[PDB]
Amino acid sequence: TRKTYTLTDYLKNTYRLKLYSLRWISDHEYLYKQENNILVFNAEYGNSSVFLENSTFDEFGHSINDYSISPDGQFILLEYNYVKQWRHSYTASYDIYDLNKRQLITEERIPNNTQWVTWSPVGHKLAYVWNNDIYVKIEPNLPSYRITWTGKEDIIYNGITDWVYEEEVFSAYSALWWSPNGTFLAYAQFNDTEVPLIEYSFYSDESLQYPKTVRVPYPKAGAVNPTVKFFVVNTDSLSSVTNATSIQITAPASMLIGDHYLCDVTWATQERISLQWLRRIQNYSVMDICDYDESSGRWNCLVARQHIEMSTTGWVGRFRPSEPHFTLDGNSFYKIISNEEGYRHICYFQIDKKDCTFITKGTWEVIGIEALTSDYLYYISNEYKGMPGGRNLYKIQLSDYTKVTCLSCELNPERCQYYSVSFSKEAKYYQLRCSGPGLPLYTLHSSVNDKGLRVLEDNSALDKMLQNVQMPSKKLDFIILNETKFWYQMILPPHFDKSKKYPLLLDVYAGPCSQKADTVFRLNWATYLASTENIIVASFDGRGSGYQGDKIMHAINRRLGTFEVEDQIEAARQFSKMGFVDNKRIAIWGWSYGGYVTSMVLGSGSGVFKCGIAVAPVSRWEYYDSVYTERYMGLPTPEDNLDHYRNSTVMSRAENFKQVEYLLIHGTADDNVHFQQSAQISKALVDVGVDFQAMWYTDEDHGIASSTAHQHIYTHMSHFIKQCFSLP
Amino acid sequence: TRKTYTLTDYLKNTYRLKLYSLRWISDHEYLYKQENNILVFNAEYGNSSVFLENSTFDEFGHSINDYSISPDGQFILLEYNYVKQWRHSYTASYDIYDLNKRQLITEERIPNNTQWVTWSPVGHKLAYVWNNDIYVKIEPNLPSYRITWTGKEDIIYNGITDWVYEEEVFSAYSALWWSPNGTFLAYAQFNDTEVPLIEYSFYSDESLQYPKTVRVPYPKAGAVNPTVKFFVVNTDSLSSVTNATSIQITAPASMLIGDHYLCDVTWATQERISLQWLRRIQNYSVMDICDYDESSGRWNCLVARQHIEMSTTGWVGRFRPSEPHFTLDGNSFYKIISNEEGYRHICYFQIDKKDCTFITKGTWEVIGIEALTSDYLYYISNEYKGMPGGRNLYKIQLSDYTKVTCLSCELNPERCQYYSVSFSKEAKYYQLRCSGPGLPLYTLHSSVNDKGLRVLEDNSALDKMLQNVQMPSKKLDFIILNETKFWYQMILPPHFDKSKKYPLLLDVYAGPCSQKADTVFRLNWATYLASTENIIVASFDGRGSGYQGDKIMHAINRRLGTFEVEDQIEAARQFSKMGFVDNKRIAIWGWSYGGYVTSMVLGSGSGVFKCGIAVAPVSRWEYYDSVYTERYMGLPTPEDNLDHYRNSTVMSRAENFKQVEYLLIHGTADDNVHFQQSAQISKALVDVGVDFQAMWYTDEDHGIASSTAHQHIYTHMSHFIKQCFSLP
């Protein structure tokens, strides 16, 4: 008999997905790391040359975390002494190696504890942030020019984001934007002076006698937010004798009237920059289009070139207003916006006209704009077969919008229904990356006639290994609630028999714009539960879920902890009535927003669920960050939405946990969903005399991702689920 | 069939022990509370009168936490707005009520947030501490005189102890001592400037948006300790001088050479004070006897009156050097000291002679000196029947040491083997308080003839209730190890049958000078476990235990986590050898030092124990406080005892926890054993891949004593023990 996919297989990564991560360096060539060597490939023919031998830094004396080759291929930035901070932020030490003179640069080195570094988009200039200040190097061996002098730890951030902008706005630590040819360097400055600090203990190694208190400027819902300023510096006119002059671009009057955010920065041309600003009440945004004035050295943003984006049903954008995609001349742009039917489609704008023209339409949505030429726009959408959980690449003829061609739909329809893409510099070639329902498949293509050049990686090695394993299957289908179709997925045990009753685990996210029912192939904890333990692992996308239009997505506006919680209960109620589900054995689990929903479900008094697990859950919206929380909830003030903030807590449902088995887990060094959130759940459960299971993870953050904690958490939860389901 | 003593009986206090708490106000009268009325009793005849009617303060507008009548019976101090701090410390509001005028004093009120308040021992003066400074009021309605101006929160403490002196030295928040007739006020001043702070989050009510960081000056083992100074002020000079001088009494040269502590303050006469000082290396103490010099207004401590107390085998005293009991003229004193055979006995000293005379002797110990008259000294000891866990009151004739009468031994020898005593002001009467083996019994006696006057409380109501319950029994006996008797106790299930095999739970303290084998009657968790669950709950006093001589007590000197841990393992082996124990069902539990020992035992690899529970355990000696830890361990330095501090951690035994089922519990706001201690245990277990059960208690301290958390912890532990023993 053949083996099953075990908990150890998941924890030890016995079955590995192969990748094909390339970096385009031009319109015809890409870099690829093979056996620690860096190769250059010609996309047309597939031939290669060694760019950098692995042995070049054998005597370096430090372990190199990462490499970054300058756009001109003349230099390599060597990253070492990496120290993680938050999701994207970290510090590191850097060395520059000259590829032509085959030597490490020892003069005017980038300092240790550097926070961010980036090459210019063309050539080899560098911009870096150190001690919260921006520096520019024109040549790697030459002295830096100091750009800002105001940088101050936890207070003034120049060219780097603070906690909330990193996590919730830019999904990045960098707040630097080079102009297309590198003449100008645009940057944001954040001021956290009056932002309150979250404080928590960090225990460190056993040798530390007194715990350390970590203090992070973090605005909770309704608290004082950081303030922002935007500047542009000309890097071609820097002096060794004089301090660099930064030109400020101020936010429009419609933003300055109150609290706001800088939400997007996109260069249009060598002398034109676009910025989007968002009000703290996130249903109103404005784009400014700013032009460099050669005579005055100023940046002017004409009122006639402003573009307003607003929502009457919810917030603006999926998580923020979308990025514009400018034409070669920068006189017009393409941008994803919600249409009159509430579906996200591509609109074509003129820089000086209010009305835009929709180029795509239908009861489906564009996911992202991927490439633009004078003749075609390339995008990813879930149009194909009306499946919101599938993704394909399309091209639209700009001279005729009726001519839309799917480029990935028919390549391999049984294996591939979820794609992402990477285009070369001027869209001459594209790499397609299929991630499911079958094994990932990486292919290379030429745009002229959409030729499928070659297979880069087909995962045939893993397919051979998986033939000897009793793997689970995945069912993707829908249920109908009040005339609307809502999709679900079921990870089904091997040899699934509809005449047998299986225990069911509801795997939850259910946050705004979440999607848990899709065609992606995954090897995770659910694979083991279905394969070894014979548990069905179900996921459901109800009200508030994404990629299906605003009628569904905005249904939870100002009302978190309502419809999305009721919809998970309803889906389980419907699954419990199916012939193959044991109604005495239904469980629920989730992490983050999924942990909040699991806890709200377990406290609903529904009687559908026997047990459940919440990992790092939100418990009360006033404890979570301003940017994410307020986007959906507004402000927690009597005049705004305080009553709903107060009635949507987990703590108020404590008495209802009397009839369920609950396991509550949280890392003590969680900078994102503070340990406080679970500390308040446990205190409420103790207050009403409800017994429950708990586990804290010393010094672990939101990810509970260290090798040992990751193995321990999944081992602990597996014991809990098996005990709940009476499985030996 | 009779009911058993259930978990709810314990948690809801269904069977209540009646007490008889009296307050002596003179040599022949006491105060007692009966149905919220304060009654005054005549000791000689037993007749009473209403001292203060329960309706007196119905219109006060505040709930009165406690009261204190002035020694002269003229005023009553009313304590309200009580806010608990540590084990003894708290703040409160105070009002003074004039008992003659039958009116509340409205002028010159004691301020809100007062830290400590005490009447003078005679009359009605008051000394109080507010904002870390001392104040004196000569009359209740008159202005206060400020004594100190150096008070500073967390830095300078005048007349109150810092964290460590409160918990480990004085067992009190108060650091002020009135002279016998109230002329002088003596006080200590603590300086915590360089003492490091323990920092931890406090979550508070769910309404609190950001957690608070609690910061406490707390010296961990080997850290910078608070420094101390001692002063005496003449309170009779206050109304005559603008700013009365606080005269300092400096520690002797033998103490000033290094770190030291002030460990005892005892007034001998109106003009003679005794002070005991202890070196940071707690095996050397010095008593100074200081006299007021009327011509200079100074206090002088004659070197001829100095008394040295040292130990070659361990530390000095059980937990600190004992207090002296001065004869009326203050020319001689009685003090409990370890004799040449290592047994604690009463020694008689002349103030200016170095050699003392032992007045008691034998292989047993004096527990405490209770009263001293011109003819007799009264003391408690464990002499009776050679039982170290028994306590009786004895009377020794001062003019003939061969005349020693046991006052309590034969009163009710079957019911009463553990006594404490409360003497009237000049020892004319005494209340005896029997706490076991039978139900507690409170009796009143006349000292003139040692006759029993009456039974104050016999718990007859509870005796009647318990007749309908299948109560457990208690066995107190000993085992011989290496020719030494070691005492143990067992809580035996009802209808105990020696032919059956019972599951056993080892209930541990086992810290230096601990005693878990005694004659006290208790209604606790063990009562439920034996009665309802049929578990034997055993406790053992091994090496390091108290009240049996220094050979046993000092056996663990500089070696915590060695013999006392081994002796608990050996006790379980010996209990198995008895034939009524299921060797497959042996568990172990403890709180504080008992949690450390439980954890050391579970990590020993002995194979003896199936499971265990550690509640708020010490895990590493460097995390615990300097005073307690260093008394037994010395300093954590390479020159001193660092090697043993590093060898005696719970964390180093993590790998062995793979052989057991462990439950780890800790309150997050534990100021005593920091949550850090269990956070380091859990991280070490996660690091070696050991599964275990955990429970944190939000905002609970070392006692986990709030009504809800107390019920929650015992319910959670009961499920764990029952699961480990396969009990339905």
Ligand SMILES: CN1C(=O)Cn2c1nc1nc(N3CCC[C@@H](N)C3)n(Cc3cc(F)ccc3C#N)c1c2=O
């Ligand atoms: C896979 N997954 C789940 O299963 C549940 N879940 C998951 N991913 C997620 N990514 C996100 N963010 C979306 C906005 C930008 C960035 N903050 C990442 N959130 C939101 C989120 C919601 C919350 F209330 C508490 C913490 C987080 C967090 N973090 C989730 C999430 O809740």
Ligand SMILES: CN1C(=O)Cn2c1nc1nc(N3CCC[C@@H](N)C3)n(Cc3cc(F)ccc3C#N)c1c2=O
């Ligand atoms: C009933 N009981 C047990 O069962 C286990 N236990 C118990 N009482 C106790 N009282 C004490 N102190 C004695 C010195 C003065 C004062 N600090 C109280 N300690 C010592 C103790 C030792 C330790 F390592 C961690 C915390 C404590 C604490 N606190 C215990 C104890 O350990």
Ligand SMILES: *[C@@H]1O[C@H](CO)[C@@H](O[C@@H]2O[C@H](CO)[C@@H](O)[C@H](O)[C@H]2NC(C)=O)[C@H](O)[C@H]1NC(C)=O
């Ligand atoms: C891939 O193959 C082509 C030839 O088919 C190479 O193009 C040549 O470039 C090299 C040096 O870079 C010269 O020796 C030839 O004269 C070139 N021929 C043509 C037709 O351009 C190319 O270098 C190869 N690419 C890689 C990345 O190895």
Ligand SMILES: *[C@@H]1O[C@H](CO)[C@@H](O[C@@H]2O[C@H](CO)[C@@H](O)[C@H](O)[C@H]2NC(C)=O)[C@H](O)[C@H]1NC(C)=O
């Ligand atoms: C980055 O850190 C290293 C280590 O602190 C610095 O390296 C030098 O190397 C040794 C120790 O490894 C020291 O004796 C010197 O004081 C260091 N300084 C110099 C100037 O050589 C290194 O200088 C730091 N790099 C930068 C760019 O500041």
Ligand SMILES: *[C@@H]1O[C@H](CO)[C@@H](O[C@@H]2O[C@H](CO)[C@@H](O)[C@H](O)[C@H]2NC(C)=O)[C@H](O)[C@H]1NC(C)=O
């Ligand atoms: C960062 O923002 C703060 C305001 O949060 C600016 O500081 C001053 O703010 C205080 C209130 O905290 C006012 O008293 C002052 O009028 C403000 N200005 C000055 C010049 O003192 C602070 O200047 C900002 N820093 C930067 C570099 O922008």
Ligand SMILES: *[C@@H]1O[C@H](CO)[C@@H](O[C@@H]2O[C@H](CO)[C@@H](O)[C@H](O)[C@H]2NC(C)=O)[C@H](O)[C@H]1NC(C)=O
């Ligand atoms: C990138 O673009 C900038 C801005 O368009 C170019 O700078 C201009 O160049 C011409 C010289 O050919 C001058 O007339 C202008 O005064 C420059 N403007 C500024 C603002 O400096 C620049 O040449 C380009 N750089 C590269 C490397 O192509």
Ligand SMILES: *[C@@H]1O[C@H](CO)[C@@H](O[C@@H]2O[C@H](CO)[C@@H](O)[C@H](O)[C@H]2NC(C)=O)[C@H](O)[C@H]1NC(C)=O
């Ligand atoms: C943005 O959202 C806000 C909050 O829902 C909307 O606010 C209106 O103004 C106040 C809030 O201070 C309420 O009294 C009204 O009920 C709101 N009007 C409604 C719900 O129609 C605001 O209208 C929104 N902006 C847009 C452009 O829709």
Ligand SMILES: *[C@@H]1O[C@H](CO)[C@@H](O[C@@H]2O[C@H](CO)[C@@H](O)[C@H](O)[C@H]2NC(C)=O)[C@H](O)[C@H]1NC(C)=O
């Ligand atoms: C207990 O009883 C005694 C004696 O009956 C009371 O003693 C006092 O005796 C005198 C006789 O001269 C009576 O006139 C008084 O009633 C008593 N004095 C006072 C001040 O009350 C005694 O007081 C009683 N004690 C209590 C506490 O009620």
Ligand SMILES: *[C@@H]1O[C@H](CO)[C@@H](O[C@@H]2O[C@H](CO)[C@@H](O)[C@H](O)[C@H]2NC(C)=O)[C@H](O)[C@H]1NC(C)=O
């Ligand atoms: C408490 O102790 C601190 C030292 O731990 C004393 O502070 C020093 O005071 C002197 C003045 O005599 C200064 O010159 C030092 O710089 C101080 N040191 C520190 C670390 O603060 C303090 O005076 C003592 N306070 C009292 C009231 O005794």
Ligand SMILES: *[C@@H]1O[C@H](CO)[C@@H](O[C@@H]2O[C@H](CO)[C@@H](O)[C@H](O)[C@H]2NC(C)=O)[C@H](O)[C@H]1NC(C)=O
């Ligand atoms: C009462 O006397 C004390 C002792 O001299 C005074 O305390 C001094 O106060 C001054 C500053 O006002 C400092 O020079 C000294 O360091 C203090 N010494 C001590 C021991 O505190 C005190 O201020 C006096 N109070 C009044 C009202 O005069």
Ligand SMILES: *[C@@H]1O[C@H](CO)[C@@H](O[C@@H]2O[C@H](CO)[C@@H](O)[C@H](O)[C@H]2NC(C)=O)[C@H](O)[C@H]1NC(C)=O
């Ligand atoms: C309480 O004791 C103090 C100290 O002995 C007494 O004060 C002394 O009184 C005598 C008179 O007998 C004088 O010789 C001294 O000058 C006093 N000394 C001081 C320091 O004040 C006090 O009188 C006694 N008080 C009462 C009320 O008996």
Ligand SMILES: *C1O[C@H](CO)[C@@H](O)[C@H](O)[C@H]1NC(C)=O
């Ligand atoms: C005072 O005691 C209680 C209230 O606590 C009440 O039952 C009683 O009537 C009162 N007075 C007397 C004299 O018992």
Ligand SMILES: *[C@@H]1O[C@H](CO)[C@@H](O)[C@H](O)[C@H]1NC(C)=O
């Ligand atoms: C540049 O600005 C900084 C910060 O104000 C100043 O201290 C420094 O001296 C300046 N250098 C020149 C060359 O102006």
Ligand SMILES: *[C@@H]1O[C@H](CO)[C@@H](O)[C@H](O)[C@H]1NC(C)=O
């Ligand atoms: C204590 O606080 C209350 C409430 O603010 C106030 O009315 C009262 O005057 C205070 N008492 C004293 C003695 O300061």
Ligand SMILES: *[C@@H]1O[C@H](CO)[C@@H](O)[C@H](O)[C@H]1NC(C)=O
């Ligand atoms: C006190 O303890 C230290 C450390 O054990 C020791 O070196 C010293 O001699 C001791 N004092 C006595 C009287 O034994």
Ligand code: NA
């Ligand atoms: Na091909």
